[PDB]
Design a protein around this ligand. Structure first.
Ligand code: LIW
Length: 145
């Protein structure tokens, strides 16, 4: 669903903007303004909390011009290996943002667009099914937002 794609572009932009960088922002364009906000906030606390499992994980996969989508999907699978939930859902995004920020550091913003697509796909072929069977996103905001 295009809706999801909007969240990715928005979340990614917010993550990049936090490090000074910039990109095609999405905090107002489409709809689901509440979802975007609730997500951004949820992402912040994500990194903050949790001592281990975060700084090392990001290193597990180093997105590269040669890297394939299959290599990125494997990292995501591990995240949702013991089921799926709003808690882990945020991880998916927080993980993508980190990759984008890294690509920029190595003068590879072009990769950013790629990560965005890779996320949109997995989002509509793994979590999408679950999200629909959990009160959609509206619930994520009602509980966490
Ligand atoms: C109230 C508050 C606002 C507090 S902050 C918060 C805490 C946890 C999750 C979200 C928000 N939100 C809040 C509280 C509790 C909840 S909750 O549904 O009970 N969910 C959790 O507590 C929770 C979910 C997943 C977790 N890991 C992710 C993947 N693994 C490696 C791991 C750990 C960390 C990062 C990446 C990875 C990872 C990387 C690469 C591949 C796979 C996994 C191990 C650890 C740890 C805790 C959700 C939310 N939520 O917003 O969705």
């Amino acid at each position: 669903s295009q809706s999801n794609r909007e969240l990715v572009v928005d979340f990614l932009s917010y993550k990049l903007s936090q490090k000074g960088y910039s990109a095609g922002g999405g905090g107002g364009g489409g709809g689901m303004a509440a979802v975007k906000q609730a997500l951004r906030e949820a992402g912040d606390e994500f990194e903050l909390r949790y001592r281990r499992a975060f700084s090392d994980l990001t290193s597990q996969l180093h997105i590269t011009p040669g890297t394939a989508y299959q290599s990125f999907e494997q990292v995501v699978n591990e995240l949702f290996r013991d089921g799926v939930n709003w808690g882990r859902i945020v991880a998916f995004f927080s993980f993508g943002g980190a990759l984008c920020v890294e690509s920029v550091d190595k003068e590879m913003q072009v990769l950013v667009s790629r990560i965005a697509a890779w996320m949109a796909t997995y989002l509509n072929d793994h979590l999408e099914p679950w999200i629909q069977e959990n009160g959609g996103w509206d619930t994520f905001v009602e509980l966490y937002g």
